[PDB]
Design a protein around this ligand. Sequence first.
Ligand SMILES: Nc1ncnc2c1ncn2[C@@H]1O[C@H](COP(=O)(O)OP(=O)(O)CP(=O)(O)O)[C@@H](O)[C@H]1O
Ligand SMILES: [Ca+2]
Ligand SMILES: [Ca+2]
Ligand SMILES: [Mg+2]
Length: 974
Amino acid sequence: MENAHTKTVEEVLGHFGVNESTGLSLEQVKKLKERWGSNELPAEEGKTLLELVIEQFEDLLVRILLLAACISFVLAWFEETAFVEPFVILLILVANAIVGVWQERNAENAIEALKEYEPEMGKVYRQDRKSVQRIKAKDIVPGDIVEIAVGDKVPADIRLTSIKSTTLRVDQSILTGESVSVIKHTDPVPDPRAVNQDKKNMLFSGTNIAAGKAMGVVVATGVNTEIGKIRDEMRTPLQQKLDEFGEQLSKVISLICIAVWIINIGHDPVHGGSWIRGAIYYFKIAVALAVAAIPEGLPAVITTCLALGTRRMAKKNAIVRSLPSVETLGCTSVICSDKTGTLTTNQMSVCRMFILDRVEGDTCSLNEFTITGSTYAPIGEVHKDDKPVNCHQYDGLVELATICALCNDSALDYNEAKGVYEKVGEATETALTCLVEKMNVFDTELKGLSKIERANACNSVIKQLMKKEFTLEFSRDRKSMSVYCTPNKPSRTSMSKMFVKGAPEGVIDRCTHIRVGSTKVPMTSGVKQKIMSVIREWGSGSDTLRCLALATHDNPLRREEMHLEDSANFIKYETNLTFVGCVGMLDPPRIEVASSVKLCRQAGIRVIMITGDNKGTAVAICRRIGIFGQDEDVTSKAFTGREFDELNPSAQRDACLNARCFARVEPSHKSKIVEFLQSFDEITAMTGDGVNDAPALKKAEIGIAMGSGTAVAKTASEMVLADDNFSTIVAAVEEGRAIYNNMKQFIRYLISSNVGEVVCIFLTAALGFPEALIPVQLLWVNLVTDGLPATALGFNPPDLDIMNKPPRNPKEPLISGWLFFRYLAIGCYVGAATVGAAAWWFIAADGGPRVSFYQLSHFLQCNPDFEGVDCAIFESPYPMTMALSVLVTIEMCNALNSLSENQSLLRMPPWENIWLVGSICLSMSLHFLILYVEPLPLIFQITPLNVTQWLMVLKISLPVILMDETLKFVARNY
Ligand SMILES: Nc1ncnc2c1ncn2[C@@H]1O[C@H](COP(=O)(O)OP(=O)(O)CP(=O)(O)O)[C@@H](O)[C@H]1O
Ligand SMILES: [Ca+2]
Ligand SMILES: [Ca+2]
Ligand SMILES: [Mg+2]
């Protein structure tokens, strides 16, 4: 069937043979799942193996190294060994690129294993249950009645059949781009070619509900769904700080490497007088040194790390849906957080309640009761004085129960697979449903009721006696909700009424009378305080009760007189109200929450609670959690909304740096509160479960949503805790601080090692020593030192003291002033200590000719004063092996100083990072290989080192870690 939106409601239901009330039969489903199918999309596009490889080679620093292997391939085509130059530049570009793809792949496998763990549900009306029940989204088929309410994600494609709120509002941005939400209706839109945005009696799979509650008929599932047809269609702040460093570093290399080509312009004797052949060889060196000095693996490591971070986060059950959100989480200096569903288990049960007992003047006693039942199950009982009572004996309790049943958008739903009761709709409203089951104010025989019909059994006895004509949906500005009811019994002594529940402070202002069991009397000021005081110690008490009031309108307007189009008129219609009673709820803090406030205070992160609840309740939970001490003075650290607006901006910006608790706060104020916290240069993260945290979740630099929370809240946030495990946030912060720490050690290794590679070329030129390396050797120390050894730094373990330092400010220079000195001082030695390897053979070593120092400086001059020395000895391949080995081993040793920033090699030993070992062995193996295997030393121009040379190679290398160890000591001891 096509063009559902042009046909009327009666037409679309008769097409499937369903009625709106009872829904779809068990036979009807299996037939339609045959003709249509499971309501899902198949497999995924994912990534082909080649796309991952190609985006790796798209990068400035990797292109230039490809060219230097084309140059080295063009020149090697005229050599009449030079063919190894391009092959060995290709080698380091392929090692560093292989690790990046493996991490990307087996992390991609991790996010999809987590996202598709918990099965999406959908509320339907089928004939096996007289009540609403939630099934898997996939077993929904074109035909069955679907119910949706605020925060819900639309599970299929639905023709609206009746809105239960006065208006219904939808966020269709995923499918239409519409940033703002939209309204809907049930009448038919006749334009049959109408685009999706003008299909206004329709919902679409994938979109969310911004406000209201409705139900409709499913018209298309699976791939025939409006969003499923389009299935085939289709820079972090550190990376930008790193790319600025990537270009500006190559600038000084180009200079240093053009310099290295001008200094040796005089040398040409060994080339055959051809300055055309003389200057070709050094363009090969300026390229070889440029290749060697360039951090080729810098790009491949950044994305390897963010890939590894998403892997570790999915293992902790956190869906990361925005790649820069883990890095940003490191610099977080304040963590705003919702209360009810986020800091709190969101598992409610009414456990206290009261109606009025008698009112005489300013005096008044009240009947308090206690209800048992921690969970949502409708099993439990009602005590007065710790003994059970029949609630039908107290008239005011009968009314209290009427208001909870009829002013309720929610119901209980028995999950026969799990054997529990779950909430259809919102927690608060469910706790009232579960309460009218425990009260049973009409003495109705629940003897033989299935566990399914036990959930909403007594709710229906009330609903049978009252036709609910309309309902003035709950709005977070008037903090209440109303319902228009008319008794099914004829009208003579019974009339219509409104039934009101909401925040007690605001409801009781609009209460001008009080119901005393079966009678009504005017509201006095002595009774208002009996109530507000009971509310106070309910919320400051041990269970930190969350509580609301309940009132009845005894003379409401008529259905016609009421103007229901502007929501600002709802509060006007709930005004001459009669107080009935209050209920007190239950809501434990999540178990791991308290220990997280302690770990964040310790890491320099302020946590602030933003909530809409009572201030008493709010502060009382900050005392349980530990935001406040059990005896702290919260007089300037905790404000309601109105108390923060009635403030001078001098002492209102004073509050935004000290206060740790903002209560009675609307979705705008949370957004404004984050705004203030940002204007003080603080990276804020916001944690929310519900529809009122959505404006605040976008505003924060990181928004974190709860897994069991609404879809409208997950849609607004960069990370999702599938767990509900609040400790993951702190772990996510530790991971983000761990990634930034690891870029610096990578920098500290490549910068310190490779300045030495340059310092030693600008040294042998200064002393007129014979040149120390040939292109094919610099391209070997390049491959062997700057490749897998450097990339392995991305797996360093966290600093032993990583979560006790405060957050670092992103408005810094990447590299400190001291750090720059530390790079040079080590690499200054590295260049020096490898030139002395060539000098050691030439003078002090027993195996080399003890040539005079004068003679080595002017070795070109050889022969009156340089007499006694053979001439060809100066180009022996002995000093070139002796330096190239010291380089690779010095660089290997200096690769171990990059395990931690200042933790010495004893507190953090080299076996905490196993992979950095495997690379140093592989490169030392590769070096040992071209140094000892049969035909290889000829290509690289090296002599196999004997046994005692290495004891002088080591004797020169190990001092490079003794140097940095003393640099590390001065770092932490200041
Ligand atoms: N269906 C409902 N009907 C009447 N009142 C409701 C209601 N749901 C919530 N309220 C009341 O409105 C007040 C403010 O609503 P809001 O949702 O913003 O805060 P909250 O405490 O309910 C959740 P949070 O801690 O995430 O802010 C609540 O304190 C509650 O007393
Ligand atoms: Ca390099
Ligand atoms: Ca190097
Ligand atoms: Mg909430």
